[PDB]
Amino acid sequence: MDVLTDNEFYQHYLQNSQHMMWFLGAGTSRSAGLPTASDIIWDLKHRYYCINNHAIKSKIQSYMDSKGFPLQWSPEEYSFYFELVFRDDYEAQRKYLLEALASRKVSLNIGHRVLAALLEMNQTKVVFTTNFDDVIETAFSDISGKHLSVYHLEGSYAALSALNTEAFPIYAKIHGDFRYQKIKNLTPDLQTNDREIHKCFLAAAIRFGLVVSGYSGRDENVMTMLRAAIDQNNAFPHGLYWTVPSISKSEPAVQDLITYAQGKGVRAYLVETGTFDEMLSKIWRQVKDKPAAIDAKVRTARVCPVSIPLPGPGKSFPALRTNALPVVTQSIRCGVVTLASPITFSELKERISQKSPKALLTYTEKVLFLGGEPEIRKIFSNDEINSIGQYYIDEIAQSVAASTFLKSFVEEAILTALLREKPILHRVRHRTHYAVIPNASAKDDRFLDLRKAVGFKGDLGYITGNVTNAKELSWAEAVSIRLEERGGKLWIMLKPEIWIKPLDRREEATDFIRSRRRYRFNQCSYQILDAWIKILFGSIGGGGTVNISCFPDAEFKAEFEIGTRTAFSLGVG
Amino acid sequence: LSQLAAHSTIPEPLLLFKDNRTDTHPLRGLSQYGPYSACFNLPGQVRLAYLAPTEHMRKLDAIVRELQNPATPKEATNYYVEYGGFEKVFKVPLVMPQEHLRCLALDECHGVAANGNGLALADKIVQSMSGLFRQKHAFDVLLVYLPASWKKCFEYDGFDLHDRIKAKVAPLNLPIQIINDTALTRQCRANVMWGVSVALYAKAGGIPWKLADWDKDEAYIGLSYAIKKNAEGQEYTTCCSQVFDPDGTGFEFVAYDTREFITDRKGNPYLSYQEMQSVLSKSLHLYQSSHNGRMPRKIFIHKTTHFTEDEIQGAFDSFSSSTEIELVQIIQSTNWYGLKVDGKKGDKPVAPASYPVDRGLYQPLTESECLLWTQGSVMGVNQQNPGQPVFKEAALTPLPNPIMLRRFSGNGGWHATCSSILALTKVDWNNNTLYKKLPVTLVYSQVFADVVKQTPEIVNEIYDYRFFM
DNA sequence: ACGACGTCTAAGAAACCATTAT
RNA sequence: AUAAUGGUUUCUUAGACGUCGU
Ligand SMILES: NC(=O)c1ccc[n+]([C@@H]2O[C@H](COP(=O)([O-])OP(=O)(O)OC[C@H]3O[C@@H](n4cnc5c(N)ncnc54)[C@H](O)[C@@H]3O)[C@@H](O)[C@H]2O)c1
C-alpha cells in the first residue's frame, strides 16, 4: 500500500541526487527508435502467423490462447517465441537481432540527453542497464566529446575496483537473461564475467539509492541479483524507487518485488511519473549549477521562423476571383494636439459624444485627429491646448499591423473618404461598417445595375422594401467594408449583405433574409459584387485606380489611391 | 498589382474498400464493393439491444425493421444513392434483440419526463443499464431512445444528458446509439438509413472505408479546448489530443489532465512548456505502443489557437532529434470568400462559372499563411447527371468559405499540409455527408474535450474511438 | 518594477433557431 | 442526440498600448 506520489518523488531527488544509482531498461530506449521486447514479440508472433495491418491483433492473440501458449505479458514469451521462429539458427538469430536493434533511427531524445548531461557533471555516478545498444554512449559522446567507460561481457574485470577507485561515471551493460541467446548456453566462462559484474552491483547498491525506469522484470538473473542486494544489511540507504508509466499495468512481478522490499524493511515505493522523457525533463527542471554549454545541448534551442517562399503568377484559366481590393497608399499626414494634462481614451470618447465634430479622432501616446482646427478647438477649449502639430505615419501597413488604434482610425478615414459625396448611407453594427442603400433614393440610374443583379430570369428586382410578415420593419441592400493587413499590404474586403432598419429588431426578419439569399449562386454573386464595386468606386471594372479624399477642404485631409480591380490568381502551368 | 501569385488544387482523395478497390464516393463505394473490414471478417455480426420505455419501445423496433430493407432518397438526390439493406452493403447480418435483451425503465422514465431532473436521471439510467453487467457477450451495440419529454432534463445551462451518459458508459465498454424524435422523421428515409447503418457498423468494430494513399511516413495530432463554465465566478478550460495514421484510423486517444488539478483552475487555453511536453510524450508513447514500437518520420500538429513560446519548444522536446515537426493553426473565420471564373472554351469567352470553386483549391497569401477551401464544387460524384458538379452546402450557403493555416513551424511546402488536411477531412464515420469543414483531428479533439469537461474527477486514462463517436 | 482599471482588434465556445444540395 | 452548418444572442480569451496609485 506504501506507494509514493508523483510530486513526492521530486523533492527527495532534488535534495539528495548524488547518492542515486539508475537501472535502465528497454523502455528508456523506446523513444530513441529502437523497439522494446514487446514490439519484437508482436513482430515475431505476427511473423509466425504469416506492412501487415495491426488491426487483427485480437484474432491472432485468441488463436495463440487456443493452442495454450504461456500467457500474454508473461515473462516467458521472449525466449519461447525466439526459439519457435528461429529454431536453432544462431546466425539468423544474430542477423535478426542486429537489424532491429541496429544504429538505424538511433536518434536521441530529451531524456537521453538529460541523462548524459547528468553523467557529465558529478551528479549521477553509476548507471546500470540491460540494453546492448549505444544510445547512452552516443549521447554522452555528443554532449561531452569524450568516451564513456563501458563495462560489459568483453573482458571488463574492473567494475568493482572502479567503484573503490571511484572511477565515475561507471556504465555497466549487463547480459541479463536473453541478449542473443540464453545465459545457459555460454560455455567459454562468460557466465563468470556476468557473475563478477553482478557482484559489483552489491557494493554499488550498499551506498547508493536505486531508481529503476523502463524495466519490466522479464529477466530472472536480474531479479535474483536485486533480491540478493536487498538481503544485504542497510541496502539502499536512500531507498528504492521503481518508476512506471501507469499503475494499472504495473507488472505483478514488480509489485511482488516492491512488497518484498517493504516487508524486509526498505524505503521502497512504486512511483508513477509517466514516460521516461517526461520524468527526465521534470528532474532536469530543478537542477542547480547548470553549465552554460550543457544547457544548449540538453534542451532544443530556438527554432528558426517559418518562411515558405511565395510562388509566381500562374497560367491555367479555371481562375479564382477574391473580394479584396488593394490599397496602394502607404503615407498619410494627420494632426497631433499636445495637451497640458494627459487624458484617457474613455474621456476622449465621452467628449466626442458630447458635441458632434466634423472630424475623426483617436488616442495613442499622443492624440491624433483628422479634420479642421476649429473642430478640435470646439472639442477642446483653448486653455488646455498648447500647440498643434503633425504626425507622420509612414508605411501604414506595418503601423496598422503593430498598433491596433491606428487600424480603426485608418479604416474610418478610408470609409469616410469612400462614402463622401454620394447618396449611399452609413451604418455601423458590432464595429463593422455598412453602405446601405437609401429607401427614399433607391430609384435612380446609379443603382440600376444592382437591380439587374438581384432579379430573376432577366426581370428587374427590388433593392429596398418592407419585410413581408412585419408592418413596421424595412429592408435594404447593403455591403460590409473592412480593412485587413496581410503580408505587408492593405486590402479592403467587401461583402454584400441585407440591412434591417431597426437594428435591435433583426431577429424578426431572419427567415426573410435567408429566403432572399438562397439562390445567389456563383454567377449572381459575381454580378452583385461587380455592381457594388461599380457603385462605390464610380468607375466600372477594369479601371486602374481612383483617388478618394477625406476632408478635402481641410488642413489635415486624407488622400488614398485604392485600386478597383479585385485580387485574382491563376493556376500553375 | 492585384495578382495573388498562383494557386494549386489538391485532387479529391480516393477511398479504399473491400479487395483494395478505390472510389471517391463513400456510399457508392460501399454499395458496389463493400466495407474494408469485409476482407478479413472483423465484425462477425451486429447484434442490438433496446433500452427505452415500452410505450416508446415499438417505434424503436420499427427503425430496426427499416435498417434491413431498401430505401430511396427523396432529397439531395444528386449525391445520395439507393440504400440496399444491411446484409447487402456491409455483407453482415443485422441481428435483432432477443427476449432477454429488451431492458426497460418504465417507472423511472415518465417521472423524470414530468420533472426537471439532471444528474439523478443520468445515474439512474446507467444503473438500469448495469443490470446486464455480466452477460455482456450477447450484443455489440445498444440502441437507447430518449423520449421528447426527457427534453427538459436534456440540458439546462451546463449539464448535458447525452454527454454524461456517454461518459458513464465508456468505462463499461459498450457502444451506444441514441435515437431521438428527429431520426424517426425528416421524410427522407435514405439519409437516416445511410447515417445510422455506417455508425452501427463502425461501433460494432468495423472499418467502413479507408484512405487509399496510405504509404507515407507521417502522423497527425490535434488539440482543442472547451469552456467548462462552473456555477461560480470562474471559467475552466479543458483540452485533449489524438493520433492518426496516413490511412486515417487512429483508434485511441490520451485523456490527460493538465498538471496538478488541485489549485490550478486554468483560465486560458494555452499549455505551458511542461504540460505540452507531457501531452505530446504520452501521445507518442501511445502511438508507439499501438504500432509495435515504430516511430514516425514526420509529425503534424493542428491547433485552433496559436502556438506560444512554451508550446513550440515543448513540442520540439517530445520527439527525436531527427523527426520533422510541422505545427499548424487552423482558423475557421476569414474575410475572403473567392469566386470561380471559367476560361475561354470553344467560341465562349471567359465568364463566371456556374458551380463554385473546387474543393481542394489552396491559395498562398504570406510566407507563412495560406487559404484552404475544403468546401466547394466536387466532380465525379453526381448520381443523376454524369458531368455536373456537386456542392454539398447548397441548402445553407450559396457559396463556400475557406479556412486559414498559419504554419508555425516546418520548412517544407504547402502541398503536403493541404493534402494531409484534405485527406483527413474525409474519414469521419459519424458524418454521412461527403466531407467536413475541418479535419478529423480538430473534430475529435473538440468532442473528446466536450465529453471530458463533464467529469468531477481527473480521469487520466486512454479511451477508445467508438465510445464517444 | 508592477497591480488596478479603462480602450482597441482578433478569434472562438455556448446555446437556440432554421432548412435539406442549380 | 442519424447527420451537415448557416444565422442570432451573449460570454470570454489573447495581444497591444494608456492613466493612476504602489
Ligand atoms: N534496446 C535494447 O537493448 C533491447 C531491445 C529489445 C529487447 N531487449 C531485451 O529485452 C529484454 C528485457 O528487457 P525489458 O524488461 O526492458 O523489456 P520490456 O519490453 O518488457 O520493457 C518495457 C517496460 O518499459 C515500459 N515503457 C515502455 N515505454 C516506455 C517509455 N516511453 N518510457 C518509460 N517506460 C516505458 C513498459 O511499460 C515496460 O514496463 C532485455 O534482456 C533485453 O536484452 C533489449
Residue nearest to nucleotide D14 (CA to C1'): B268
Mutate to test the pocket of ligand 1, among A22, A23, A30, A36 (most ligand atoms within 8 A of CB): A36
Q: Work out which ligand 1 atom sits closest to the CA atom of A177.
A: 41
What are residue A15's phi and psi, to 5 degrees?
A: -65, -65
Q: Is A36 in the pocket of ligand 1 (CB under 6 A)?
A: yes
**B194 CB-to-strand D distance under 7 Å:** yes
Cα distance between residue B387 and residue B381, in whole Å? 9
Distance B282 CA to C7 C1' (A): 43
Task: For residue A395, give the nearest of A489, A474, A487, A297 by alpha carbon.
Answer: A489
Cα B46 to chain centroid, rounded: 21
Whether residue A249 lies within 8 A of chain B, CB to CB, comes out as no
Distance CA B167, CA B179 (A): 17
Q: Specify the residue with its C-alpha closest to ligand 1, atom 19.
A: A37
Q: Are strands B252-255 and B461-464 parallel, antiparallel or unpaired?
A: antiparallel
A511 touches strand C (CB under 7 A): yes
Nearest residue to B12 (alpha-carbon basis) of B244, B337, B442, B358? B358
Write phi, then psi, for B365 (nearest 5 degrees): -115, -35
Determine whether the interchain pair A275/B285 forms a contact, defined as Cβ–Cβ distance below 8 Å.
yes
The secondary structure element, H or E, covering residue A480 is: strand A475-486
Whole-number Å distance between alpha carbons of A529 and A564: 12
- Smallest CA-to-CA distance from A467 within A509, A405, A434 is with A509
Closest CA to A268 of A243, A301, A287: A243
Cβ of A176 closer than 6 Å to ligand 1, yes or no, is yes
Exposure string over B397-406, b if 16+ CB within 10 A, otherwise e:
ebbbbbbbbb
> Helix A8-15 vs helix A276-285: angle between axes, to the nearest 10 degrees?
50
Cα dist from B157 to A108, A413, B118, B146, B147, whole Å: 49, 43, 11, 19, 20
Give yes or no for CB of B267 within 7 Å of strand D: yes
Measure CA to C1' and name the residue nearest D12: B235
Distance A207 CA to ligand 1 centre (A): 27
Rounded Cα gap, residues A525 and B401, in angstroms: 14
Q: Which of A300, A308, A312 sits opposite B313 (nearest CB)?
A: A300
The pairing of strands B237-242 and B252-255 is: antiparallel
Q: Which amino acid is at A170?
A: I
Place of cell 463554385: B356
Cα separation, A100 vs A47, in Å, equals 14
DSSP E strands: which ranges in B12-87? 15-16, 22-23, 46-51
B311 CB neighbours strand D below 7 A: no
Cα–Cα distance, A300 to A298 (Å, whole number): 7
Q: Is B469 annotated as a binding residue?
A: yes
Strand, helix or coil for residue A520: coil
User: What gap in Å lies between CA B84 and CA B67, rounded to an integer?
Assistant: 9
Confirm whether any atom of chain D, the nucleic acid strand, is less than 7 Å from CB of B428: yes
From the CA of B105, how many Å to the nearest CA of chain A? Answer: 34
* Distance in Å, alpha carbon of B244 to nearest chain A alpha carbon: 14
Establish whether residue A124 lines the binding site of ligand 1, counting it when its CB lies within 6 angstroms of any ligand atom. Answer: no
SS3 content of chain B, % helix, strand, coil (to 5): 30, 20, 50
User: Which residue, by CA, sits nearest to atom 5 of ligand 1?
Assistant: A36
Q: Which of residues 242-261 of B touch strand C (CB under 7 A)?
A: none
Choose among A567, A305, A546, A325: nearest CA to A422.
Answer: A546
For residue A469, the CA-to-ligand 1 centroid distance in Å is: 73
Nearest-CB residue to B318 (from A30, A35, A277): A277
B433 is near strand D: CB distance < 7 Å: yes
Q: Is the CB of A243 under 6 A from ligand 1?
A: no
CA distance A555 to A537: 25
A36 CA to middle of ligand 1, Å? 5
Could B293 and A529 be called an inter-chain contact, meaning their C-beta atoms sit closer than 8 Å? no
Distances (CA, A) of B288 to B140, B293, B344: 28, 4, 53
Nearest in space to B393 (alpha carbons), one of B357, B439, B361:
B357
Q: Which of B318, B406, B407 to mutate to test the interface with A (most CBs of A within 10 A)?
A: B318
For residue A365, how many other CB atoms are within 10 A of its CB? 8
Type of residue found at A75: P
A322–B338 C-beta distance less than 8 A: yes
Pairing of strands A331-339, A360-363: unpaired
The answer to whether the beta carbon of residue B160 comes closer than 7 angstroms to any atom of strand C is yes
Largest pairwise CA distance in chain B = 75
Q: What single-letter amino acid sits at A208?
A: F
CB of B42 within 8 A of CB of B210? no
The CA distance from A200 to A161, in Å, is 8
Nearest 10 degrees: CA dihedral of B131, B133, B138, B141?
90
**Which parts of B383-451 are beta strand (E)?**
403-405
What whole-number distance in Å separates Cα of residue A409 and Cα of residue A494? Answer: 18
Q: Is the CB of A245 under 6 A from ligand 1?
A: yes
Q: Closest CA to D8 C1' — which residue? A: A507
Residue from B232, B353, B223 nearest B300 by CA: B223
The full set of domains in chain A, from first to last, is 8-32+108-298 (3.40.50.1220), 37-97 (no CATH), 324-571 (no CATH)
Is any Cβ of chain B less than 8 angstroms from the Cβ of A10?
no
Question: Among A81, A127, A532, which residue's Cα sits nearest to residue A325?
Answer: A532
Nine-digit cell string for A442: 433607391
Chain C footprint positions (protein CB, under 7 Å) = 6-16, 18-22
Q: Do B341 and A321 touch (CB under 8 A)?
A: yes
> Of residues 84 to 143 in chain B, which lie within 7 A of strand C by their beta carbon?
none
Asked if B367 and A309 come within 8 Å (Cβ–Cβ), the reply is: yes
Residue with cell string 504520452: B282
How many residues belong to chain B? Answer: 469
Nearest to A129 by CA among A164, A169, A158: A169
Q: Ligand 1 pocket, A37 CB below 6 A?
A: yes
Inter-chain contact B409–A303, Cβ cutoff 8 Å?
Answer: yes
CA distance A172 to chain B (A): 25
Distances (CA, A) of B115 to A46, B107, B153: 56, 13, 8
Q: How distant, in Å, are the alpha carbons of A106, A331, A440, A486 from that of A396?
A: 51, 6, 38, 12
Handedness of CA A115, A118, A119, A125 (dihedral sign): negative
What's the rounded Cα separation, in Å, for the pair A103 and B322?
Answer: 13
- DSSP state letters, B349-409: --EE-SS--BTTEEEEEETTEEEE--SSBB-S--SSSSS--B-TTTTT-SS---EEE---S
Interface of A with B in 485-514 (CB under 8 A): 486-487, 493, 495
Do A317 and B343 count as a contact with CB atoms less than 8 A apart? Answer: yes
Distances in whole angstroms, Cα of residue A493 to Cα of each of A420, A528, B357: 19, 14, 19
Q: What is the grid cell recorded at A60?
A: 491472432
- Distance from C-alpha of A76 to C-alpha of A62, rounded to nearest angstrom: 18
- Chain B residue whose CA is closest to A496: B337
CA-to-CA distance for B145 and A156, rounded, in angstroms?
72
Q: Which nucleotide lies nearest residue A402, CA to C1'?
A: D16
Residue B368 CA distance to nucleotide C8 C1' (Å)? 26
Cβ neighbours of A479 in B, within 8 Å: none
Is residue A171 within 8 A of residue A129, CB to CB? The reply is yes
Q: Which amino acid is at A526?
A: Y
Which nucleotide lies nearest residue B194, CA to C1'? D2
User: Do residue A521 and residue B365 have CB atoms under 8 angstroms apart?
Assistant: no
Q: Is B248 in a helix, a strand, or coil?
A: coil
Does strand D come within 7 Å of the CB of B272?
Answer: no
Cβ-based contacts of B351 with chain A (< 8 Å): 523
Looking at the complex, does the CB of residue A275 fall below 8 Å from at least one CB of chain B? Answer: yes
Method of structure determination: cryo-EM
In the β-sheet with B15-16, what is the strand arrangement from edge to edge?
B22-23, B15-16, B210-211
Residues 6+ away with beta carbon under 8 Å from A46: A52, A60
Nearest nucleotide to A432 (CA to C1') is C9
One-letter amino acid for residue A347 of the chain: E
Q: How many residues does chain A have?
A: 573
Q: CB-hemisphere CA count at 13 Å for B380?
A: 11
Peptide bond into B70 cis (omega under 30): no
Residue A215 CB–ligand 1 contact under 6 Å: yes
